């Protein structure tokens, strides 16, 4: 029987039949090939397993044997799993730049990556310059932006201006990018986003031995611990260079630092598999952190 598979990227969907023993890799390979993506190291296929967990699809394993929720079209999302350290020197393909711009922006819009008011407006203008090209008195008439979801929700909730005010504001910033290309614009966007405190960092809800709530941030540059109340500022940091060994044993995870004088960090995950992922993420992420410091 043919296994029906849908793989949406951020601007495209793809639907084909799959073989009852097609390897995750073979699947990933088809998708990237069809899209014409070369920078394949940042990306993954994400599906949802039977327990409800969003999971990354493993390439060295039969795509049919990883327990993805069994619906008619087997559904996956093709998203960046890892983020570069510097967008401009790490994203060479227009395709890659595009799939990033989109994924990043979406999160910026969903209050996922925090972004303060002025920068939000600044970003929006780059997003509209990307969409619409040069501003034009004759074309873009008062309200030409009424249909576009342009600003982080919290931005709108906190600084109360009118809808047509925020628009005037972006319009002003839009008017100024006159001459930018759709491509450049998306890049100028990313260059600003990649500096946001929450950009390219995966959070996990944890608690220490004392049983108090915390967040663990795994990212391009290492681990970071946050207080539940603040997702932005790290309480303690651990770059890769300053970490010797990370391990877990059941729900208990432990970080061991390079200098012996430091009291190694210990936290408690809500389930075993949560650590499994934390371990997986760090490994893949550190690996790339090395790989871009060799030839």
């Amino acid at each position: 029987k043919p296994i029906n598979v849908r793989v949406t990227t951020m601007d495209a969907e793809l639907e084909f039949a799959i073989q009852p023993n097609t390897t995750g890799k073979q699947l990933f390979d088809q998708v990237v090939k069809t899209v014409g993506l070369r920078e394949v190291w940042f990306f993954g296929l994400q599906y949802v397993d039977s327990k409800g967990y969003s999971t990354w699809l493993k390439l060295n394993k039969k795509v049919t044997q990883q327990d993805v929720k069994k619906e008619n079209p087997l559904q996956f999302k093709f998203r960046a799993k890892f983020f570069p350290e510097d967008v401009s020197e790490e994203l060479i393909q227009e395709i890659t730049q595009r799939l990033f711009f989109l994924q990043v922006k979406e999160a910026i819009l969903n209050d996922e990556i925090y972004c303060p008011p002025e920068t939000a407006v600044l970003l929006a203008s780059y997003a509209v310059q990307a969409k619409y090209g040069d501003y034009n008195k004759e074309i873009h008439k008062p309200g030409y932006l009424a249909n576009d979801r342009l600003l982080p929700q919290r931005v709108l909730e906190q600084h109360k201006l009118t809808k047509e005010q925020w628009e005037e504001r972006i319009q002003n910033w839009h008017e100024e990018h006159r001459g930018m290309l759709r491509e450049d614009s998306m890049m100028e966007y990313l260059k600003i986003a990649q500096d946001l405190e929450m950009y390219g960092v995966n959070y996990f809800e944890i608690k220490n031995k004392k049983g108090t709530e915390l967040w663990l941030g795994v990212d391009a540059l290492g681990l970071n611990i946050y207080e539940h109340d603040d997702k932005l500022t790290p309480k303690i940091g651990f770059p890769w260079s300053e970490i010797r060994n990370i391990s877990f044993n059941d729900k208990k995870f432990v970080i061991k630092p390079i200098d012996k004088k430091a009291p190694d960090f210990v936290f408690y995950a809500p389930r075993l598999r949560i650590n499994k992922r934390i371990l997986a993420l760090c490994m893949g992420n550190h690996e790339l952190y090395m790989r871009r410091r060799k030839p």
Binding site: I246, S247, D250, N275, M283
Partner: peptide, 7 residues
């Protein structure tokens, strides 16, 4: 139970 060594 698992372990990884970084730096």
């Amino acid at each position: 139970m698992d372990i990884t060594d970084i730096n």
